[PDB]
Structures are given as C-alpha cells and as structure tokens.
Amino acid sequence: SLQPPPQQLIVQNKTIDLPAVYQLNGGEEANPHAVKVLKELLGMLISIGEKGDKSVRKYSRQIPDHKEGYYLSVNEKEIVLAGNDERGTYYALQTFAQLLKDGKLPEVEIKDYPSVRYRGVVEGFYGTPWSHQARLSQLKFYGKNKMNTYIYGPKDDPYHSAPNWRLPYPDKEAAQLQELVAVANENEVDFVWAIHPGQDIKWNKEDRDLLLAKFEKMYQLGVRSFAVFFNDISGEGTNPQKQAELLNYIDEKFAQVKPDINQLVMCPTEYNKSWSNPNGNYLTTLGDKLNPSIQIMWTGDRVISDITRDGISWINERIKRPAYIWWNFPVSDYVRDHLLLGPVYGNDTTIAKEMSGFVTNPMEHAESSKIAIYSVASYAWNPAKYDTWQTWKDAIRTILPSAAEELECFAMHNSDLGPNGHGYRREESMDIQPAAERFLKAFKEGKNYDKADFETLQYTFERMKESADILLMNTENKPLIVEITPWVHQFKLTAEMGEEVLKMVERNESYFLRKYNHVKALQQQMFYIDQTSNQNPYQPGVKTATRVIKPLIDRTFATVVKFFNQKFNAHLDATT
C-alpha cells in the first residue's frame, strides 16, 4: 500500500535488504529536508538529487517533467530518489519511507507526480481555531501525504478578520506564526496566510495601504503565499469591481515585486452556484478583470456539496480559469453536535484538469479531521486511482495503529450529519443497516423477527462497547481521544441501551420491568451528556449513531413497550 498511490508503479516480486553498508551520492546538493528524512531512515549506491544535479545525471530521462514529480527505483545494485524539483525529491522520500518494512524493501520502479496542482487544508471554519500544537502536528501530516497547501484563515481570529486585520499580530502570536511557517517549509507545505477584510473595509487608499502593510509584516514573518477572503460578508465589501481592483493592485505592487511569492488566492462573495445570480455580474467581472495568475475559490453547487463535471464546467466557464476548490467537508460548524468521521466520496474522479487546487475545510477537531484529510490528499494527488473505502481504512490505521479496528467501528457509526439547513447527508452504518431494516419491518406489521438479524444487532452492540472502552484508554494519540471522548461516552451508552432493548424483546414480566427501568436510566445518562458536554451556542450537545442505530433502538423500545402496555394492561411511558 502507498498513500497516495503513485501514477506509475512496477513491482518485482523480489525484495532487497535495506543496505547494511551503503554509498551516498548527492547529500550535499539535493533538497536538505529530503536528505534529512533519508539520513533518518538509515557498498551499495543510493543516489539523491533534483534534475540538473550531478548525482542523478544518469536518470534524468526517467524523471517526470511535472511540477513535484519524482523517479524512484530500488533493485539489488542501487537506489534512486530523484525529483523534478526539490519538492519532488521530498515526495520521492515520503514514498520511500512507506516501502521500507522491517529493514526490507520491495524491488520497484515508480514514476510519480500530482494530478492537481494545489492540494491541502483550509482552516476556514467557525469556532475555536486549532491550537498551536494541533497546527504543528497537522503540518507534519500534510508533508507525509504530499499536501502542499495550508490556508490559515480562522473565522474567529481577530488579526485575520474585522476589525484588527489592519494591525500587525502582537508578539506572542507573531512568534508562533513564524514557527508555523518554518515547520511548513521543512515539510514542504505552502503556508498561505489569508486575510478577511470585507466586513468593514473602506474602499479608500488608507485601507488599501493598511492591507499592503499587513501583507508586508506577514512577509517579514516568513510568509510566501497569500489570500484575500470575501466569503459571508454583507455591505460595501461585496463589490466585485473593487475586489478585483484590490487583488490586481496587490498583485502588481506585491506578489510581482517580491522575489519569492507563490500562491495568491481570492475567495469570492458568491462562492457556490446556488448563491450566484444568473442575471447579475459578480462572477463574469471577476473572471474578466482578475489577473490570470490569481486563483479563485469555489465550493460547488451549494455551500456544502460534492464536485461534479457539470458543476465545475459551469464555474470554469464564468471565471475563465480552472476553479480552486474549497470543499466543505468534514467541516461541521453547522452541525457542531456531530462528528463526521466517515469516508471522503462523491467527488468526480475524472476532472483533475478542471481544477487548480482542492482544499478541504475541516472540523474544529483537528486530529479527527485527519481521516478525511488523508483521503482528500490521496484523492487530489491521484483521483484516477481514488479508492474511497480502502483510503478510509488506511487513514485510520495510520492515525491510530494500536486500535484501528476499534476506531473503524466508532467512525462507521459516526458519519452522518443528521438533518440540517444545507440538506447535506452522508451514509452511515450501512453494514448493519440491512439487518436493522428487516428486524424492524417484522414488528411494526406483526410477523416474526429473524434470529440472524437479531444476533447481528446484538453483535454490533457488543462491538460498539469494546471499541468505546478501548478508545477511551488509548494513549497512543491522546489528543484525538480528548476530542472524541464525549462522543465515545454517548456511543457506549447507545450500545448499552441497545443490548437492554433487545433483552426486552426476549421472557417474564418482572424481567421486562427491570430492563425497562434500566433503559430509562440509560436514556437519562444520554440526556445528561447531551446537556453538559460541548455546550456551544449553536447546536449544543453530543449526538451519535443517529442515522440507523439510534432510531432503530428508539423504535424497538416504543414497540415492545406497546405490546406490553396492552398484553398486561399497564401504563408504562414509551417516549425516548
């Protein structure tokens, strides 16, 4: 397994030992970040360098002629790690480290390069911005998965948005950003610093200059990429004319004036089809005026949506360039009581040429976003070979090797968003879903329930329980466990409720009553967790397994308690 999977892979069913004694060619001339990892990883010749370096002159025709491309070869006599550019050589070694198993390598040859030019994460949700340590750890992660873009733009950071966008960061925050930029460079990620001025911007030279001086200050901290965000604002800052003016002005007097500026990106006010006016001008203006080199961000047909051929041809035609995709998943800032831990899917795998970048807007839970981010990295680099389910499992196993089955069990039933203002849904729990649909069917009309379905429901509950208890105590990735703990509790309780509801479906009158009282106590523990964990202004609480598992239990409870209330004439409460 290689994530992301290379564009070209030939494997000989032979395997070389990692060389006990070796000879290093090119250590002094190849990318120092690439060379560090290699030296870290460990007579026989190993050749490392970029195209044009002496060490790799012999393989110069093997090396793909693509930005970030590389050639990698292992066989008995030599090893080659040769990039088309420095980032390519870094990537060559990210692939290398995934092959080295027990101090052994397969004999292979790889020609590799990304299908989409910019691949990464936009930290652009509403809510508590990632902590400093969460960001350090993200950046190492992006580098390993060949993500090359990090767009820093937290809605709730006041030096990024209204009104302190005009002020230089204070010293503590500045020294921190400076460290983020450095770690980004070492992992070969563009740190793109976004600014969001449009809520209170005045279209005068005074504000235009304070913006420039803001950028200038960021440049002094080490930033080499920039963005200007116009999303979700009202007022005079929505003027398309003024926006493109301001972006071209920044282009002409800043990006074009400094030696080493990489990405310059804007995010439009109308940023999805659904919100663009058919007869108004917003998007054709932008397409016509913005200097060709300036990227434009786009979320798809709606604020939350998957990217299709129709969707992206539609946008590319109006902005006269290929859209830079802002994909709003696994972001959950509008369903803050759900975790979105399922697979990444729904995005057309044939349209690499029609996009200039693909970024994911993640959750406010940094570590839990790693499942989707790994997947988005695998997709943006090699969409043609994009495998939904296998990537999801690879992610989990990379993120928590010591309890990967347990993490899969939990994430499998934490995928859906539940009903929401954007109408966007994910599958969840399809494994146990057929058995649940049947078993329920049987009851609400009257016929028998199948013993196989029943045993499976009971096997599910039992596995949910082991997984919850194993995850709570896992110390391999504590930060992930802190994020998900409230949901782990809810999940354990849901499964205990399900085991008790099934026992009601199998006996004698006072057993049924004990179970019924146990269930009511379990309901209340859930209400408790729901009222006191994750109490945020917007969707307070903790919901879990809500697509199939919860409604299954709530209904098998109402029904067995209905049967009872008439076969014994009692008045038991049946709500949930």
Ligand X SMILES: OCC1=N[C@H]2[C@@H](O1)O[C@H](CO)[C@@H](O)[C@@H]2O
Catalytic residues: 232
Number of residues that bind ligand X (CB under 6 A): 16
CA distances to 137, 218, 270, 330, 503 from 363, rounded to whole Å, are 15, 26, 23, 6, 38
CB-nearest residue to ligand X: 231
State the nearest-atom distance from the C-beta of 70 to Ca ion, in Å.
Answer: 13
Measured from the CB atom, the residue of 268 and 343 that comes closer to ligand X is 268
Contact 424, 501 (CB under 8 A): no
Give the integer Cα–Cα distance in Å for 377 and 452: 40
Residue 373's binding partner out of ligand X, Ca ion, none, with CB under 5 to 8 Å set by partner kind: none
Residue 505's binding partner out of ligand X, Ca ion, none, with CB under 5 to 8 Å set by partner kind: none
Stretch that binds ligand X, among 88-96, 208-216, 327-335, 505-513 (CB under 6 A): 327-335
Measured from the CB atom, the residue of 127 and 168 that comes closer to ligand X is 127
The residue whose two tokens read 């499964």 is 495
Phi, psi of 111 (to 5 degrees): -120, 125
**Residue type, position 473, single letter:** M
Contact 485, 508 (CB under 8 A): no
State the nearest-atom distance from the C-beta of 60 to Ca ion, in Å.
Answer: 13
Residue 109's binding partner out of Ca ion, ligand X, none, with CB under 5 to 8 Å set by partner kind: none
* Strand segments (E) across 84-233: 104-112, 118-123, 149-152, 190-195, 225-229
Q: Which two tokens stand for residue 213?
A: 């001086």
State the nearest-atom distance from the C-beta of 282 to ligand X, in Å.
Answer: 14
Binding mask 277-306 for ligand X (x = CB under 6 A): ----------------------x---x---
Contact 264, 225 (CB under 8 A): yes
Among 148, 328, 414, 460, binds ligand X (CB under 6 A): 328
Measured from the CB atom, the residue of 46 and 464 that comes closer to Ca ion is 46
Give the integer Cα–Cα distance in Å for 459 and 461: 6
Residue 107's binding partner out of Ca ion, ligand X, none, with CB under 5 to 8 Å set by partner kind: none
Residue 123's binding partner out of Ca ion, ligand X, none, with CB under 5 to 8 Å set by partner kind: none
State the nearest-atom distance from the C-beta of 332 to ligand X, in Å.
Answer: 8
Q: Which two tokens stand for residue 449?
A: 């329930």
Among 124, 330, 362, 486, binds ligand X (CB under 6 A): 124
Measured from the CB atom, the residue of 239 and 328 that comes closer to ligand X is 328
State the nearest-atom distance from the C-beta of 29 to ligand X, in Å.
Answer: 42
- Which region, left, alpha or beta, applies to residue 131 given φ > 0 means left and ψ of -120 to 50 means alpha? beta
Residue 95's nearest CA partner among 72, 74, 114 is: 72
Stretch that binds Ca ion, among 1-9, 52-60, 74-82, 485-493 (CB under 5 A): 52-60
Q: Which of residues 6-45 bind Ca ion (CB under 5 A)?
A: 29
SS3 of the chain: helix, strand, coil, percent, to 5: 45, 15, 40
Among 90, 226, 271, 564, binds ligand X (CB under 6 A): 271
Q: Which of residues 361-390 bind ligand X (CB under 6 A)?
A: 361
Residue 439's binding partner out of ligand X, Ca ion, none, with CB under 5 to 8 Å set by partner kind: none
State the nearest-atom distance from the C-beta of 347 to Ca ion, in Å.
Answer: 35
Stretch that binds ligand X, among 73-81, 120-128, 202-210, 336-344 (CB under 6 A): 120-128
Give the integer Cα–Cα distance in Å for 153 and 159: 10
Among 91, 118, 152, 326, binds ligand X (CB under 6 A): 326
- Other CB atoms within 10 A of residue 111 CB: 18
Stretch that binds ligand X, among 118-126, 144-152, 368-376, 383-391 (CB under 6 A): 118-126
Measured from the CB atom, the residue of 29 and 348 that comes closer to Ca ion is 29
State the nearest-atom distance from the C-beta of 275 to ligand X, in Å.
Answer: 10
Among 125, 165, 557, 564, binds ligand X (CB under 6 A): 125
**Secondary element (H or E) of residue 240:** helix 240-250
Q: Which residues, including other chains, have CB under 8 Å from residue 195's CB and lie 6 or more apart?
A: 160, 165, 211, 214, 215, 226, 227, 228, 229
Among 92, 180, 331, 526, binds ligand X (CB under 6 A): 331
Residue 53's binding partner out of Ca ion, ligand X, none, with CB under 5 to 8 Å set by partner kind: Ca ion
Q: Cα dihedral sign for 273, 277, 280, 282?
A: negative
Binding mask 384-413 for Ca ion (x = CB under 5 A): ------------------------------
State the nearest-atom distance from the C-beta of 151 to ligand X, in Å.
Answer: 10
- Other CB atoms within 10 A of residue 89 CB: 32
**Secondary element (H or E) of residue 12:** strand 8-17
Q: Which residues, including other chains, have CB under 8 Å from residue 78's CB and lie 6 or more apart?
A: 44, 45, 46, 47
Which DSSP string do the residues of 476-526 spell out, in sequence order?
A: TTHHHHHHHHHHHHHHHHHHHHHHHHHHHH---HHHHHHHHHHHHHHHHHH
User: Beta strand 104-112 with 70-74: parallel, antiparallel or unpaired?
Assistant: antiparallel
Q: Is 85 in the site for Ca ion (CB under 5 A)?
A: no
Q: Is 115 in the site for ligand X (CB under 6 A)?
A: no
Stretch that binds Ca ion, among 50-58, 160-168, 328-336, 412-420 (CB under 5 A): 50-58
Measured from the CB atom, the residue of 259 and 421 that comes closer to ligand X is 421
Q: Is 334 in the site for ligand X (CB under 6 A)?
A: yes
Q: Which two tokens stand for residue 44?
A: 């026989």
Among 50, 364, 394, 408, binds Ca ion (CB under 5 A): 50
Give the integer Cα–Cα distance in Å for 501 and 564: 13
Q: Which of residues 137-156 bind ligand X (CB under 6 A)?
A: 155
Three-class secondary structure of residue 313 per DSSP:
helix
Among 207, 232, 245, 431, binds ligand X (CB under 6 A): 232
Give the integer Cα–Cα distance in Å for 236 and 285: 16
* Strand segments (E) across 196-351: 225-229, 264-267, 295-298, 324-327
State the nearest-atom distance from the C-beta of 90 to Ca ion, in Å.
Answer: 12
Q: Is 53 in the site for Ca ion (CB under 5 A)?
A: yes
Q: Which residues bind ligand X (CB under 6 A)?
A: 124-126, 155, 231-232, 267, 271, 299, 303, 326, 328, 331, 333-334, 361
Q: Which residues in this chain contact Ca ion in the complex, by CB under 5 A?
A: 29, 50, 53
